[PDB]
Amino acid sequence: MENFQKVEKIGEGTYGVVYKARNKLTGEVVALKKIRLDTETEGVPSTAIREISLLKELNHPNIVKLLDVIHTENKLYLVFEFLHQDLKKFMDASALTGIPLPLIKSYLFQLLQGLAFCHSHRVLHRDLKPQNLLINTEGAIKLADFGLARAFGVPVRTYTHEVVTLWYRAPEILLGCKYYSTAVDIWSLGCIFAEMVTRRALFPGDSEIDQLFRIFRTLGTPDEVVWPGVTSMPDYKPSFPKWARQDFSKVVPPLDEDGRSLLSQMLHYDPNKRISAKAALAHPFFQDVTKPVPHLRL
């Protein structure tokens, strides 16, 4: 740890503080994540240690590379490759004119590649969001904090008591499914996709029930017809209001039919009907995908 020199705090993270230190040996600039853990009264669980050690191997161009895991002093530090911008900041900077469709499509395509990879390794993200997607000057976008959920967990509030966003949570998670699948990442990515297109969060709930109900008001309250087994879910209430489904043309204009079609499949209620990352990659929406360069101001 003495091998690193912090240059500036860049994030409060969900597990701990994220610094932009420099490696004193190699001289590289990196993203240092400090996961708080005691020594005796706690001390990093062996389990998490082996989990994280498996993520060090999960290398893909669309996944932020985990350079190292330092456990010294009985504490946990994660050293990640550094990026200058996350998608949230980029969308905020592109709010006035909107991110060009070609770039939106490129990012969606790359992220699906990243997910296809992780998912083929039985590793799910669980908490995809704009702030966790990082981009560079070359037009690449990468999944960040991948696997750190299963490793540790996803708390309601971060160490800074900051509330965790529910906007991208799949319905099965909200309904209490304890053993959800890779389909949850596809849902989150679908929500992000819509947001890049419309320049407004698709389902900005501020509570679990508000999130669920916002989803219901748009996609219609799910029932046994569109989601077999939904009424038997841990948190499903027969008393849920019954809202009728809305047209996608009204949800993401002016996205073309191919994008709307693809989005509809990424937002299917039934996790088993929801399109997989691999299948999504073959969607007609991507027949003319390219890799534009974004206009980034670092």
81 is in an annotated binding site: yes
Nearer to ligand 628, 80 or 216 (CB): 80
Give the shortest CB-46-to-ligand 628 separation in angstroms.
21
Nearer to ligand 628, 149 or 233 (CB): 149
Among 68, 127, 247, 270, the one annotated catalytic: 127
Those residues with Cβ within 8 angstroms of residue 225's Cβ, 6 or more apart along the chain or in another chain: none
Give the shortest CB-133-to-ligand 628 separation in angstroms.
8
Distances (CA, A) of 218 to 212, 215, 248, 270: 10, 5, 9, 16
Nearer to ligand 628, 105 or 142 (CB): 142
**Residue 127 is a catalytic residue:** yes
11 is in an annotated binding site: yes
CB 134 within 8 A of CB 144: yes
Residues that bind ligand 628 (CB under 6 A): 10-11, 13, 18, 31, 33, 64, 80-86, 89, 132, 134, 144-145
110 is in an annotated binding site: no
273 is in an annotated binding site: no
Nearer to ligand 628, 144 or 183 (CB): 144
Among 124, 128, 271, which Cα is nearest to 195's? 128
Give the shortest CB-49-to-ligand 628 separation in angstroms.
17
Among 269, 147, 163, 166, which Cα is nearest to 216's? 269
Give the shortest CB-55-to-ligand 628 separation in angstroms.
10
Binding site members: 10-18, 33, 81-83, 86, 129-132, 145
Binding site members for Mg(2+): 132, 145
Among all residues, which ones are annotated catalytic? 127
